[PDB]
Amino acid sequence: PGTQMTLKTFHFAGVASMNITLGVPRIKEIINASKAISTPIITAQLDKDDDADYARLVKGRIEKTLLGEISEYIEEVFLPDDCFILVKLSLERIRLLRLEVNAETVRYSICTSKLRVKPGDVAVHGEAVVCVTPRENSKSSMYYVLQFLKEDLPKVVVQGIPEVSRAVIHIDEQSGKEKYKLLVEGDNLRAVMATHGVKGTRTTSNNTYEVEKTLGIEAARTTIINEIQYTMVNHGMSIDRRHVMLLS
């Protein structure tokens, strides 16, 4: 069937987004058993799957949210006695996005892989403002490193998983119900199984290496079977399951 697959189009997993490698490169990526593949997806099921208000909380709990995406203005303030960087959290967009972040959370999100700033150097003067007093890095750096943090501090993460690129709430169409599954284009299976609100007993992945690292070798075998059979089905081919079972 590798010669039969014309590398067709019209495949989005029914959401008109989330493009997936199918065809001959998909079978190639499965049998190469590489550690990292293009377009990974961690399909998660939600436990209280009735309402969208429950879905957007756990959507914002796993999706990568930047500090520069929730701050209304990020300014340097020069003073005759000091110099620092001032960040005012737009708390209205925090209240709308339903997130567990305030100034004390942003203070804890800073001092994780940024220049070795000290926790004493960051204060929480209000419920919005977070000032970062810089220091001398003293390793091929001048104290005018405020320009480094002026473009680098909006790239820290305050809420979510660092490896997840994006996510989309997915619905069904059948008349019997309306429940909300969750498509996570990310590369960390253990993180999505551990966040509160996601049914960890019923979530899967495309990448077999993450399934081997998290759930074991037997789940990786079942993932190889299901993914080869899914790729063969989506192009009009049909193989008896004993062959893909023998390959896995």
Partner: peptide, 11 residues
């Protein structure tokens, strides 16, 4: 007092 505001893009 001298200042410089970036005003980055929100969600």
């Amino acid at each position: 007092k001298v200042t410089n505001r970036k005003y980055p893009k929100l969600k």
